[PDB]
Amino acid sequence: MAGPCYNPNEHYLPASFKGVPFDADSSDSEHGRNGAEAEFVFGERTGYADLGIKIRSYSIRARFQTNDHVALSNAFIAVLESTGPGLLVHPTRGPVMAACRSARVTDSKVDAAGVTYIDIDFVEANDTVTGFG
Amino acid sequence: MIKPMRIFIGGEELETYTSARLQRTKKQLTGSLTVEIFLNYVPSKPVIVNAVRGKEILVYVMGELAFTGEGGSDVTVNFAKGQGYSVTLTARGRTKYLVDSSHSHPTGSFKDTSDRKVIEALVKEHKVVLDWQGTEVKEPKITLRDGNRIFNEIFERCNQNCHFAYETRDGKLLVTDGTTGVVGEDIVLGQNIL
Numbered sequence: 001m002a003g004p005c006y007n008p009n010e011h012y013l014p015a016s017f018k019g020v021p022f023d024a025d026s027s028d029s030e031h032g033r034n035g036a037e038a039e040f041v042f043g044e045r046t047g048y049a050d051l052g053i054k055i056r057s058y059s060i061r062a063r064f065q066t067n068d069h070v071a072l073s074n075a076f077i078a079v080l081e082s083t084g085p086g087l088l089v090h091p092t093r094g095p096v097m098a099a100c101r102s103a104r105v106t107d108s109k110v111d112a113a114g115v116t117y118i119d120i121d122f123v124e125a126n127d128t129v130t131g132f133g
Numbered sequence: 134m135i136k137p138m139r140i141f142i143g144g145e146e147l148e149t150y151t152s153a154r155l156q157r158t159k160k161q162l163t164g165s166l167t168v169e170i171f172l173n174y175v176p177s178k179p180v181i182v183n184a185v186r187g188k189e190i191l192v193y194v195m196g197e198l199a200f201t202g203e204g205g206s207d208v209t210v211n212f213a214k215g216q217g218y219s220v221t222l223t224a225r226g227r228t229k230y231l232v233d234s235s236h237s238h239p240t241g242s243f244k245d246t247s248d249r250k251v252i253e254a255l256v257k258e259h260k261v262v263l264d265w266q267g268t269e270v271k272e273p274k275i276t277l278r279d280g281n282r283i284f285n286e287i288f289e290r291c292n293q294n295c296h297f298a299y300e301t302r303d304g305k306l307l308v309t310d311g312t313t314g315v316v317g318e319d320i321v322l323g324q325n326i327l
Contacts, residue, residue, distance in 0.1 A: 039214065040214075041212070041214055042174070042176055
């Protein structure tokens with residue numbers, strides 16, 4: 001931030017998912033709008049149309065350091081695998097309803113012992129009625 | 134290399150045949166052909182259009198005749214927003230009209246004749262030269278079905294006498310009871326098979 005009076009704990013929300021806290025380390029997103037661009041033949045003019053909003057996707061990275069990280073790590077994975085979507089407190093985007101889609105757990109015993117990294121790939125998921133309209 | 138395939142349409146060579154394909158089938162009554170041609174267009178400038186719906190087409194494979202349409206039986210102009218804009222052509226044997234014309238026989242029922250003398254009076258309404266080499270058969274009664282195609286009746290009558298009905302490479306109609314006897318190559322595995 002401009003000037004040295006930044007307090008990062010005051011601007012970044014604490015991460016969470018389905019109520020279980022965890023320590024976040026990165027925050028990304030993806031937004032857009034579905035187009036239908038078309039270019040005619042032998043013509044010097046093109047066109048465009050709008051076909052609705054595009055589905056968002058969030059990706060986060062979590063770090064575990066404290067003693068007995070395997071238990072907290074091995075216990076948090078049991079939450080990502082739970083059925084159905086749940087509330088996600090994005091560090092910057094605020095609360096948002098998302099559903100997990102993948103997770104890679106990285107670990108080692110000699111190269112790096114005492115820290116566990118886990119990359120995640122979330123997706124927005126808004127509840128819908130079951131009678132198809 | 135010396136062009137191993139050349140094509141003519143009415144006597145003006147096709148120098149832009151971006152692809153080709155020829156067929157000759159013994160179990161039918163007419164061959165076929167297909168040629169793809171590149172075509173151009175400049176906006177706000179003149180364009181010369183042929184659009185020949187009918188004319189002769191000839192194909193020579195390695196300095197030898199291999200087909201005799203009559204030609205330009207089909208004309209379609211493909212076109213794309215992307216890749217390109219081209220044209221396609223098609224052709225068939227000289228007897229094409231027999232394959233797609235209902236018979237116009239003088240009366241419609243022979244009294245007493247032979248098969249050869251009947252095929253001559255059916256084909257020769259369209260001036261297609263016959264090439265007969267099979268054995269003649271005597272038929273006390275023949276009566277062509279009213280309005281039936283030329284292809285159907287010749288095929289029907291020649292089936293019961295073991296006559297093959299297929300075209301040659303020159304533009305005739307050849308009726309034979311066996312192989313032409315022209316000995317070919319010894320296609321050996323490991324030598325030329327693919």
